[PDB]
Write a protein that binds this ligand. Structure first.
Ligand SMILES: [Mg+2]
Length: 233
């Protein structure tokens, strides 16, 4: 239950296209969330190879914790390690933790815990999220889970329309604030109601220190799509 890549190259053109579609800045270091996408093929090879029943197609992303110890340069080639751990019963199904460590040289730069489920007032910003943009996020980020792109498959897996990738939303909400993030930062997200597409969602931001609290809501109905914290280390 362990995957390794010794020297994964970074494609800057992909980093640019990731920043464009999520609304983040393309600079010399990759966005804080970008290594989710970079290591995604490595995570899915672990998930798809689970001995027991657990399907990547139609899987649900419930929670995500990123710890960045140091930025990763767009020119870096990276070491990747993934392990899967903490199978639990939930209610809606099987939960599992996928734990990824991304290294530059001998050092761990970026550390993530991803939790998946197999089913068994005026805002500080506004996000417009269309099916087209998410079709584009799926191409660029490489998560082709069809609940985000194929309506017929979304229905089959329980949703009335296609939904946004949780990690699209988790990237997009950092747009304004990311320029003030320190190099060492932790970002914790709890996904709630899926974002049904197309949608216009409002982001609420408080400065609960030394950092930020975030809540993304559906604008008509007001229910939460996610809550998150950003903190310096
Ligand atoms: Mg996260």
């Amino acid at each position: 239950r362990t995957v390794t890549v010794e020297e994964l190259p970074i494609d800057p053109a992909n980093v640019a296209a990731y920043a464009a579609v999520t609304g983040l800045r393309y600079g010399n270091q990759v966005p804080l969330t970008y290594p989710f996408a970079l290591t995604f093929p490595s995570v899915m090879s672990l998930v798809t190879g689970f001995d027991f029943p657990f399907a990547a197609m139609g899987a649900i992303h419930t929670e995500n914790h990123i710890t960045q110890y140091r930025p990763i340069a767009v020119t870096d080639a990276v070491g990747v390690r993934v392990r899967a751990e903490n199978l639990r019963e939930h209610r809606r199904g099987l939960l599992v933790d996928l734990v990824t460590n991304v290294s530059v040289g001998n050092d761990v730069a970026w550390h993530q815990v991803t939790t998946f489920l197999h089913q068994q007032p005026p805002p500080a910003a506004v996000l417009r999220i269309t099916p087209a943009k998410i079709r584009r996020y799926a191409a660029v980020g490489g998560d082709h889970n069809p609940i985000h792109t194929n309506p017929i498959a979304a229905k089959l897996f329980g949703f009335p329309t296609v939904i946004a990738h949780g990690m699209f939303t988790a990237a997009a909400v950092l747009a304004n604030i990311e320029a003030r993030f320190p190099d060492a930062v932790r970002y914790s997200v709890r996904f709630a109601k899926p974002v049904l597409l197309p949608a216009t969602a409002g982001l609420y931001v408080a400065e609960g220190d030394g950092g930020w609290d975030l809540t993304l809501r559906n604008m008509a109905k007001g229910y939460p799509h996610l809550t998150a914290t950003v903190r310096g280390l």
